[PDB]
């Protein structure tokens, strides 16, 4: 009966396993809405997607849409306090973010379920009368600048913008979307433009209700959620804006048959093949692009990748359709290159067209389409329950593209096989439509062009007629076959009954010298899935840099070897992860439980009986070398976190130590290493999901039996199972470690205040203190002082120890950042002494909500248990215990904690600082306190030698 509602879709197609309730509707002002009712959710959430993006930026103000997106957070007419939005979310267990693409601006938040209306109301205001405060504008432009600078020396962004720069300049596709101080402040000042008017002009003109989709999720009924949404959003004005479309492709004839040679920052070797194609979005019911991408990107036997990998030319391949905008898209084939591959780009591409030609010969395969359909069907039926925040943002995005009743299924289900469209798309993948780009350091000094925004060094050539002609005449290579029927498709979806002796938390159901087995039968989610987690402990995994390298290469080679076999299983919703740790090996198998034992057995056998291919060994090692080198190109704030991890751990091998020892890794030494590594192990496992206790025991026994039979594995001694300790810093100590980032012209800094061994009391002092300072830290260090885009504060936990950490990436020198953080702490000391008891309890409640938030999917709950197990703390009921203690803390308790552990003149202050200087830097408002002379760390080894080591935390 409501006049504010144009239409109400009551049957929203969902999965039969989804317990959440849905109602879609279209408001009178044209807003498409989806309501999600979940009476169990601990956090509520909303999201709004505007169908305008950076592609609609004014030509004279690059990055206006992105900039506008930052500004909406900084105040509205109804809520004028600059950080009201962020502070409210913080005080109620919430959080918020947004992003800008070429065609979308997407805003989202979550919050304690009891405060949805308050959050949603403050949120709705973003879209009616934001302030765009001139003072805030002048500040937040710096955050955007900082965000861009961060991307300037990043190879992904450089190539991203380079593609745009090599097509039609007249086309909106060529726009620089991020923006920076120049395009947002500096140039607009030369040209006398009022940026604040431009923000208001843009907001008013494009942020129309007809271009908006909204998704809200809470405990409230569908009826109540309707009243709430309608009340707040029907007030949004409808300017009846036409939806932008871009019918003309950014790549015209002059832009085809072109080759680009590009110099990267990292030492990487990549080949990009790109085919311009028509917008395939309408064909979404058949999805011709996904069909073709499925085949061209296949990694099993007979595939394009298989042959290229055997030729020793590539290691990995990506293929398929790539989004552009409304009216144009891309089909791409990207491979990485071996040293050999780099000298065979022409032959590689020939092989690409040979495979495409195979597809034309056989023509569309309906069983293939039918297979994809049925997998997606099963995928959708047994879909994991999503986290609200991401779910609402995802859906608010696609409401623009599908009927209300179809949004949930739209991105999952294939409906009708259309070979006519497949052939049509396949017809665009020809040499006369190709663009080729090669990324390699080998082009250094040989380029004649510069992209103006990032400065990328490149050369452009026309592909020779001879070569194009050669590609057009591609004969059928007998090495290329269509994929076989997927043998890993699951068939047994039976949910095993809950055993009588079943337990709420994992139970230790096996405890021998060989292995410690933790088991839980799923009692929450009831999907036909299981998680199998294994830690293999061995001293020889991390005993020195050389052996660390070999543990890595061992597992990489093993994965490279299994890829063809396991790729199918991956498509059938059964994946595995295998990586080396500082304690040995980690192996996880996740997915549909039906065929898990088959893949698991295959992996353990491959481990125990592995025969290294020498050609594969040389290639992977070479890549691993560059991998170590390329760390030089990581962000400063990452270098900072890295160096700190090195400093504070008992044992740690640096990139340089590893890279030197790499040269000494020969095939013989690796072949010797593996049987040595496997000879003595301890296995600690978590088996959690749709399995019974006997099944679990059976799985564990196979793993042991396989290792014993093929590798002659024997148990470790209990005395060999020592975990590493954390360096115990002296009272009132302050150490500083300094490094330079050779790639980036930003500086980084991490500050670590080491409190003490983890324990219920110490844990909750830190966590509560961190909760209280969280929002203020962001608002002060970034929003007010604008030190940088990346500003972070929070707990740090390692080796059973913990402390408070600040992480900042800035253009200012680290020694400056030091004072500002220190200045801030004093600000917080006074702020807390002032805050009301009611405000203090608010934070306690917020922290509690965050800690008690239930896991929504099996993998989240398993990760939670697994954390307790590898940490050797085994505190599975931790949350109830720790939250309960939390509620008994007082303001006076936290003040004592601060005055004793954290304050500048605290008796037990334990501070270490890592400073990463920018590329060009030199060696070195509220009032900042005076700081003591810091002990400059000259040498990590010398540093650790002079300090004691903490104990290890005792198990529960
Ligand atoms: O920049 C953006 C979105 C992010 C930028 C952003 C947000 C969070 C980050 C956390 C760690 C490191 C960098 C980060 C960068 N952004 N843009 N405008 C506001 C925000 C963050 N919004 C918040 O409400 C917030 C965030 C953190 C907090 F503690 C309290 C409130 N889109 O382009
Ligand atoms: Zn941003």
Numbering used by the authors: 43 to 966, 980 to 1011
Copy the relevant paper text.
The structure of IDE is atypical with a very large catalytic chamber, called ‘crypt', formed by two joining N- and C-terminal domains. The zinc ion is located in the N-terminal domain, but key residues forming the hydrolytic site are located in both domains, resulting in constitution of the catalytic site only in the closed state. IDE has two substrate binding sites, one at the catalytic cleft and the other at the exosite that is distal away from the catalytic cleft. All of these results are consistent with the recognized role of IDE as major protease acting in the degradation of insulin and Aβ.
